[PDB]
């Protein structure tokens, strides 16, 4: 077998990116300032964190084992619980005490045959009394919200129609449905998309099979009252490339960014319209909604080149690190229109941004507040001379949060400091009676001075000021998505406005 | 109540001394080099580590909650398990989410009435299938060797005759007895010493009550074939001082270092002879044995002034930090002699040293190998300019290990490097057939460059070279005592030579 390294080597595991790989508890975290005593609930986030050194050199960040963090808040105190998802990968590699899974989404490089290849490392959501740890190439893994015990791969009581479950399901605040899909839904390289939904009682509602024009990556999607929208990233899969040991994904400069629109209820596969946006990268969806005219407003991060530059085109052509900016874009779509090409989007702000969150009480409906990560290259904002040597590589960088009020156009920016970077934030309603976007924001900071992580608590009345700063004595590796589960919400999700 | 701080402040909890307070697992630790595959067993060590910020300012290091580390070795792989002892203190403070226990060994400063005040933070030993977490003001806490679950305060099936159990019991390799004592054995300020032993079947054997000439600290003791020896540190307790909120311990310049000698078997309390060594500080015992003439050779660390300088004499007089050196001393005692004063000891080496270990297969018998910590002020050995600002305070410093061969007089010194310090080492016999002192040495390093801990594995054939260096991604706070439990030893203790 390929030799198993006994320590981590390479840029993707250097400095702040060095795996810690701890599981357990740290109760009564140190706090500077004061956590509002009314806050009660749990912040769950997931990070890729290789449990064992890969036999693949420069294994991408996206291929690390999912490690779940829970920050449990009550009465101004907070405890951390941390535990790896017991994926098939995790368990079998733990038995062997060496890495066995090979390249990202390429089973032909694995040292053993896996049934499920999930690292469960992308998102962690709450559904009907369980956590679901998500990875878009696989079904969810179900976990206990209290102990972070892994129950196992989850198939919704045998109802799951797809081999794949998106990392970005949407929760309708009115109907209390979880709206889902999977791409490559019948296996590697398939153009099959399965759109499906679950009612609050756990019964499957919608199940529609449709066909993608290309086998492209559909990372995120959008849901409105009457439509579901599938933006396709021009990364394309060829299984024959994979069989020769090549990458699952390869950029294609010759295609548009397809945006499929399907009726949300009662549709057939052939009812999908594949609109054609200008070539670019479909980033994370903030939210989508129907306006007065019945037109879809789709607000999402959008770049003009390949953000995932480590998967270039067939001739190795692509941007360099730190080159590509994504911007907060608004696309307009009309399902009635027979004109497939779409106009260039309008931009809501000028900042290089990603990881947009809204007040999920208005998800699928008109929203007027968005919180998002920003990366500002203006000199001084980040002390790059200090940070970059300590930072390692492989992971996106963010040096502030921004709050956009869509009505007024006002923007507040939180800047943690010159030697700190941020992850994706969460929004917490101040209480069940709070106005849209009124409450608290939490964000995990990497502190490159201390080589420690911190959890910042902000009040939306003044996003520039930290109300509290929770000081972890360990590093939490840069992660991906996270969610708030409020104690006052029985089903784990906030009530509609 | 006195206000509970919500983060750690002061020198005793700054830099590398900042509490981490994690419990759980890190499996498959990173290794540079190669762990000998024949090594099979567990290295247990304990560190004081406050779970909650004290309401006592500048609470000494010795008063922190006991946190147990286990390093489990097999086939060249190693896993870490870490868990706090569930003392009464730990449990009740965890319930309240604030500190409740007050000053070191002073119940009159506690905010609630404790039955047991142990932090169980001094030593961790193996006895009849359990770990015993030790603190000399209390009975042991029993723990599971595999899971580090706390069973509870342990009284040896109701046989424990003393309120107190030494942190330094001795294991006779021939008789398989655990030889014990407790001082202040009938409560605060009492001069009662209880000497007791347990046979390998768990039945109590010896129980002898004797009287100390002063209420002084007896931290360590020594056991020979026919005698037990009690060196008294000239720190003295006055309960009336304590009732006014004063220190449990206070140095007394006017007394000798008493060294009691009692027959090991069949004695009465009045059979003890209190010999009088020159005034000084009784450090840790390496080992003691009877020579051919029947004279006791007592080898221990010995200083000429108060090592615990933070507890000065009645007028506040004492040495400053880093001033007092301890030296590896040999005292000669004859139980037959009626001459109470003892001659100055001979010194075996010139190094400033502490934390002596022997090959415990010859404990209570003639030994000819000793391993010990050293602190070398020779320029360059420690980069103090770099380390001291990162080090915090309160904890003893050691910048190497030394191996003394007592026959040849040869000394090897392990120096981890200019920006690293060491804790107490363990010795592991190479196998059940190995000669005295032949095998492996392990020692936990604090790496001030990375602000991480490392576990070094050395071969006794060349102590200057690291065979393996296990790289922890977290800090383990400077700790106290630790022990090896070999898998090949049924009762957890090595077989006699
Ligand atoms: Cl589990
Ligand atoms: Cl326990
Ligand atoms: Fe994502
Ligand atoms: Fe000790």
UniProtKB/Swiss-Prot annotation, chains A, B:
GO terms for biological process: carotene catabolic process. Pfam families: RPE65. GO terms for molecular function: carotenoid dioxygenase activity; metal ion binding. Keywords: Dioxygenase, Iron, Metal-binding, Oxidoreductase. Induction: Expression is induced ba resveratrol but is not dependent on light. Disulfide bonds: none annotated. It catalyses: trans-resveratrol + O2 = 3,5-dihydroxybenzaldehyde + 4-hydroxybenzaldehyde; piceatannol + O2 = 3,5-dihydroxybenzaldehyde + 3,4-dihydroxybenzaldehyde. It comes from the Eukaryota. It is an enzyme of class 1 (oxidoreductase). Fe cation binds at residues 168, 219, 284, 481. Belongs to the carotenoid oxygenase family. Dioxygenase that cleaves the interphenyl C-alpha-C-beta double bond of resveratrol to yield 3,5-dihydroxybenzaldehyde and 4-hydroxybenzaldehyde. Also cleaves piceatannol, a compound that differs from resveratrol only in the occurrence of an additional hydroxyl group, which leads to the production of 3,4-dihydroxybenzaldehyde and 3,5-hydroxybenzaldehyde. Is not able to cleave trans-stilbene, 4-monohydroxy-trans-stilbene, 3,5-dihydroxy-trans-stilbene (pinosylvin), trismethoxy-resveratrol, and 3,3',5-trihydroxy-4'-methoxystilbene-3-O-beta-D-glucoside. Is not involved in carotenoid metabolism. This is Carotenoid cleavage oxygenase 1. It comes from Neurospora crassa (strain ATCC 24698 / 74-OR23-1A / CBS 708.71 / DSM 1257 / FGSC 987). The gene is cao-1.
């Amino acid at each position: 077998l390929p030799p198993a390294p006994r320590y981590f080597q390479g840029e993707n595991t250097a400095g702040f990116m060095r795996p810690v790989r701890f599981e357990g508890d740290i109760t009564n975290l140190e706090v500077v300032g004061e956590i509002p005593k009314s806050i009660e609930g749990t912040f769950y986030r997931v990070m890729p964190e290789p449990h064992l050194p890969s036999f693949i050199p420069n294994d991408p960040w996206f291929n690390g084992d999912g490690n779940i963090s829970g920050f449990y808040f009550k009465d101004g105190h907070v405890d951390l619980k941390q535990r790896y998802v017991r994926t098939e990968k995790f368990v079998r590699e733990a038995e062997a005490r060496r890495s066995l899974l090979g390249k990202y989404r390429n089973r032909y490089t694995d040292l053993v045959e896996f049934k499920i290849r999930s690292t469960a490392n992308t998102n962690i959501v709450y559904w009907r009394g369980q956590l679901l740890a998500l990875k878009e190439d696989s079904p969810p893994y179900a976990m206990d919200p209290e102990t972070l015990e892994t129950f196992g791969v989850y198939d919704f009581d045998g109802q799951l129609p797809s081999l794949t479950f998106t990392a970005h399901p949407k929760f309708d605040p009115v109907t209390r449905e979880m709206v889902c899909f999977g791409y490559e839904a019948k296996g590697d390289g398939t153009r099959d998309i399965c759109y499906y939904s679950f009612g609050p009682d756990g019964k499957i509602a919608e199940t529609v099979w449709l066909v993608s024009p290309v086998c492209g990556m559909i990372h995120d999607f959008a849901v409105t009252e009457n439509f579901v929208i599938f933006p396709i990233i021009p990364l394309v899969c060829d299984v024959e490339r994979m069989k020769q040991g090549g990458d699952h994904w390869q950029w294609d400069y010759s295609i548009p960014m397809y945006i499929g629109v399907l009726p949300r209820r009662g549709a057939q596969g052939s009812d999908v319209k594949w609109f054609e946006a200008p070539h670019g990268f479909a980033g994370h969806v903030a939210n989508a909604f129907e306006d007065d005219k019945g037109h879809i407003q789709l607000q999402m991060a959008y770049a003009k080149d390949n953000v995932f530059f480590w998967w270039p085109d067939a001739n190795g052509k692509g941007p360099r690190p730190g080159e590509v900016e994504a911007h907060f874009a608004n696309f307009v779509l009309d399902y009635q229109s027979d004109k497939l090409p779409l106009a260039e989007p309008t931009y809501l702000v000028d900042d290089d941004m990603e990881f947009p969150r809204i007040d999920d009480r208005v998800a699928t409906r008109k929203h007027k507040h968005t919180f998002f990560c920003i990366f500002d290259r203006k000199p001084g904002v980040t002390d790059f001379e200090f940070v970059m040597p300590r930072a390692g590589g492989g992971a996106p960088m963010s040096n502030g949060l921004a709050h956009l009020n869509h009505e007024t156009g006002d923007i507040q920016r939180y800047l943690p400091g010159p030697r700190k970077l941020t992850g994706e934030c969460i929004f917490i309603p101040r209480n069940s009676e709070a106005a849209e976007g009124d409450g608290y924001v939490m964000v995990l900071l990497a502190n490159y001075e201390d080589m420690c992580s911190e959890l910042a608590v902000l009040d939306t009345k003044d996003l520039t000021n930290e109300v509290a700063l929770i000081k972890l004595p360990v590093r939490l590796r840069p992660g991906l998505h996270g969610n708030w589960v409020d104690k006052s919400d029985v089903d784990g999700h906030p009530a509609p406005l």
